[PDB]
Amino acid sequence: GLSDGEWQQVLNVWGKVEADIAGHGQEVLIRLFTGHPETLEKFDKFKHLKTEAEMKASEDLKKHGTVVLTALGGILKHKAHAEAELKPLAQSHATKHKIPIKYLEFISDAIIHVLHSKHPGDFGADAQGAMTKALELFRNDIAAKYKELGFQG
Amino acid sequence: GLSDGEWQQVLNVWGKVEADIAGHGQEVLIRLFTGHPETLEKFDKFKHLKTEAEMKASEDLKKHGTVVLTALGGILKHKAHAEAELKPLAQSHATKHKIPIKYLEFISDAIIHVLHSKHPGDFGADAQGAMTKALELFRNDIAAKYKELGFQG
Numbered sequence: 489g490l491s492d493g494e495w496q497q498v499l500n501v502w503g504k505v506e507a508d509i510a511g512h513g514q515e516v517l518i519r520l521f522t523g524h525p526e527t528l529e530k531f532d533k534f535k536h537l538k539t540e541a542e543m544k545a546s547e548d549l550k551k552h553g554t555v556v557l558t559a560l561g562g563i564l565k566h567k568a569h570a571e572a573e574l575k576p577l578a579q580s581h582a583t584k585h586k587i588p589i590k591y592l593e594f595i596s597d598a599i600i601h602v603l604h605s606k607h608p609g610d611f612g613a614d615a616q617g618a619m620t621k622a623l624e625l626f627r628n629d630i631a632a633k634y635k636e637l638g639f640q641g
Numbered sequence: 642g643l644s645d646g647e648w649q650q651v652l653n654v655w656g657k658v659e660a661d662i663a664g665h666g667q668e669v670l671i672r673l674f675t676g677h678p679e680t681l682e683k684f685d686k687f688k689h690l691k692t693e694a695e696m697k698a699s700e701d702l703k704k705h706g707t708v709v710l711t712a713l714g715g716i717l718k719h720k721a722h723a724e725a726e727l728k729p730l731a732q733s734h735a736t737k738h739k740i741p742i743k744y745l746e747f748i749s750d751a752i753i754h755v756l757h758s759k760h761p762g763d764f765g766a767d768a769q770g771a772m773t774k775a776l777e778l779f780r781n782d783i784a785a786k787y788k789e790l791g792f793q794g
């Protein structure tokens with residue numbers, strides 16, 4: 489993925505977007521629909537629109553523009569924050585501590601054991617299955633960063 | 642990936658962890674070191690400690706347990722939050738709206754054009770390359786969720 493640098497560049501231009509999210513939203517959708525008319529056919533509420541002037545006149549196209557860029561902006565902001573939080577952990581475990589993925593499986597199993605032991609009424613089979621999958625996603629995230637740094641975990 | 646309920650089951654049990662992070666951190670490391678003694682060799686400060694009674698008496702071990710579960714908790718709670726925004730979007734766009742990944746590539750191109758045209762002083766070649774990579778990461782995350790839902794992309 490991106491550097492801390494790359495993410496700040498993304499978030500900086502996103503700040504400009506957020507100053508006029510409807511204006512940006514409208515332009516993005518008009519640029520999409522004009523460049524790739526087949527995209528417009530996917531929108532039951534917009535596909536009647538036939539001129540640039542009709543698309544600009546649509547109150548709801550502009551509202552939908554806001555909906556799209558608000559959802560995306562949320563996703564980019566969470567991705568930047570989560571990457572910046574994981575990167576350091578991956579880098580120390582990969583470069584100084586050199587913790588294989590097998591060891592991360594071991595501590596994952598230990599966490600599942602302690603939660604089962606301590607919180608049975610908040611950790612029956614479905615909840616334990618949830619946590620098992622969540623810690624696997626965490627290990628996969630570390631693994632992916634391990635390989636970018638060319639460490640064999 | 643996790644269902645919406647499974648992520649809440651993760652958050653609910655993690656609340657119980659944070660209520661006594663020191664105790665959980667201790668029990669997790671003791672379970673790791675007693676279940677997998679070879680993992681103890683990684684820790685200069687703990688690698689001499691032979692028994693659970695000794696491990697429980699180690700203020701450094703308990704201190705490290707808090708650090709580990711603090712780091713992991715941050716990552717889990719962020720992933721729970723991010724996924725919960727992302728999964729419904731993927732679910733709606735694969736199943737209800739029927740939007741190919743290729744179309745996500747088209748709206749990404751449109752976002753990059755509108756940013757470059759409106760904010761060139763915030764969208765030089767480095768910033769444009771960052772945003773291009775950021776939107777590819779987004780589409781990759783939607784394509785992963787599609788594939789889980791059995792949608793061809």
Ligand code: HEM
Nearest residue numbers: 527530531533555556559560729730733738740744745748
């Ligand atoms: C950056 C990419 C995209 C984002 C962030 C996004 C986000 C949204 C959101 C938040 C909604 C409303 C909630 C929902 O249905 O899930 C929505 C609805 C929808 N999106 Fe997307 N979308 C994107 C791309 C696309 C593309 C490329 C198309 C079509 C070619 C598309 C077609 C639709 C349709 C048809 C709806 C239903 C609209 C209605 O209410 O009539 N989306 N989108």
Ligand code: HEM
Nearest residue numbers: 576577580581585587591592595680683684708709712713
């Ligand atoms: C859930 C999994 C894990 C988390 C969240 C985690 C987190 C941390 C954190 C936050 C630190 C301190 C800052 C840093 O150096 O990055 C740390 C240090 C360390 N971790 Fe981990 N860790 C995990 C798994 C493991 C495992 C399985 C091992 C070894 C088997 C390991 C060995 C170490 C070592 C040796 C240090 C340095 C200890 C010191 O000098 O004080 N970690 N870890």
Ligand SMILES: [Co+2]
Nearest residue numbers: 562566722726
């Ligand atoms: Co959010």
Ligand SMILES: [Co+2]
Nearest residue numbers: 609610653654
């Ligand atoms: Co409960």
Ligand SMILES: [Co+2]
Nearest residue numbers: 569573715719
């Ligand atoms: Co955070």
Ligand SMILES: [Co+2]
Nearest residue numbers: 757761764765
């Ligand atoms: Co330029």
Ligand SMILES: [O]
Nearest residue numbers: 552553555556
């Ligand atoms: O959309």
Ligand SMILES: [O]
Nearest residue numbers: 705706708709
């Ligand atoms: O750790």
